[PDB]
Structure 1
């Protein structure tokens, strides 16, 4: 349920764009549970899960690059926690796809559903670390080390949230 969270543009250019790729591949992945998308058998779900695993490893790399220059605890510990979560989810997805592929070529819907739940947890972790990396980047923009990565607050496309309903 991150389409309401994924209100961005094609800016950011390193973090937001692969986050949008992972969001659209989740939105096409979990449509297979409704069964009206471009996914027919189970092996394309394995290739999709391998795609999100590789993209989560790349996001883990970029999150490790931004986390070196954050000075102290206040957001850096949150960022490291979400990085360990996305590392666990991607590495679990990587070699959970292999056992489902080997079950497939040696002998049928719940097999997709486990990878669907793993991808859902991976997507929640990746939007959490996108938010945490935004906080860590725009918190310490005057600090040395952040300015060399060249990620200003304008480059993030996070608008202010909606007006909360006053009644009902």
Structure 2
């Protein structure tokens, strides 16, 4: 077989990066716990994106339904689709919002999501090459999964702050126009 395992240093580097990712997913479960799902697709989408980023982390330690690079490339494209639908929703929430400090906070978090979705797309290549460098034949791109996790941790972080900022933007819309406002709030926040 022309196959070998990743070197222990990189395996440990992978593992320590997946715990960092689990802390941020903890935060996401905490935040979404509080809220009923019906009438809130921001919450549903955040859960979907977390579900997939879970397949992607599992991949890097040897578990989950992701088997080859094109699986990982596929996962990243789903996350980006779900993020794009989150952007549309949250954007609409920001347009109802009358408090500009919170309108602008929400819109800024949407930039982070677009950015980290992009970087997740790039990193999902987990590309590996043989290279003739420095007088030796070497394999490079062994950290390609370490960079994949750090993209997911960053995206996971931005999603949490985006859900929080969508809720704040919502309370300010109701604060100003009331729960009988002629136009209903874009998403509902119940328990």
Runs of 5+ consecutive residues of structure 2 not aligned to the other structure: 1-22, 129-140
Tell me, yes or no, if structure 1 residue 24 matches structure 2 residue 51. Answer: yes
User: Are the structure 2 counterparts of residues 45 and 146 from structure 1 closer, same or farther at C-alpha, using a change threshold of 3 Å?
Assistant: farther
- TM-score (norm. length: structure 1): 0.75
Structure with greater strand percent:
2
The structure having more radius of gyration, on CA atoms, is 2
Which of 83, 100, 104 is residue 56 of structure 1 equivalent to?
83
Count residues in correspondence.
Answer: 152
Runs of 5+ consecutive residues of structure 1 not aligned to the other structure: 158-168
Supply the distance in 1 between the matched residues of 2:42 and 2:64 (Cα, whole angstroms): 26
- TM-score (norm. length: structure 2): 0.67
Name 1:135's counterpart in structure 2.
168
Which of 24, 28, 33 is residue 5 of structure 1 equivalent to?
28
Which of 116, 121, 125 is residue 158 of structure 2 equivalent to?
125
More deviation, 85-94/143-152: 143-152
**Contact 1:28 / 1:37 at 8 angstroms: preserved in 2?**
yes
Aligned-CA RMSD value: 2.9
**Contact 2:93 / 2:166 at 8 angstroms: preserved in 1?**
yes
